[PDB]
């Protein structure tokens, strides 16, 4: 199952890819919340 | 077959964790879209 252990390693690695992507998405999303928060405080 | 079993369980759990995170982000994202369209009118 060298084949199976490589697939599992690629899955775990891809889940780290996805986790880092949504962590980065969250930091950008937080900026847009604050930006809107800034605008609505003005109106 | 305990080794592979708990790893597969951990992977399935991590897929639920990422799905729940993405669903919670979608709620926040939609709320930002709402704030946009309200500001665009005022």
């Amino acid at each position: 199952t060298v084949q199976a252990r490589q697939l599992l390693s690629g899955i775990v690695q891809q889940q780290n890819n996805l986790l880092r992507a949504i962590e980065a998405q969250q930091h950008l999303l937080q900026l847009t919340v604050w930006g809107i928060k800034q605008l609505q405080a003005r109106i | 077959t305990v080794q592979a079993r708990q790893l597969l369980s951990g992977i399935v759990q991590q897929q639920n964790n990422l799905l729940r995170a993405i669903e919670a982000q979608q709620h926040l994202l939609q709320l930002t879209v709402w704030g946009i369209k309200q500001l665009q009118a005022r």
């Binding site: 780290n16 | 790893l7 951990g10 991590q14 919670a24 926040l28």
Partner: peptide
């Protein structure tokens, strides 16, 4: 609004913990 930002924070911490566990289990295997 504040609800979702705080929920996301908890959800990301749990995913980071599970990622560490899976990577430990991967290497032991």
């Amino acid at each position: 609004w504040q609800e979702w930002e705080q929920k996301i924070t908890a959800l990301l911490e749990q995913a980071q913990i599970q990622q560490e566990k899976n990577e430990y289990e991967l290497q032991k295997l």
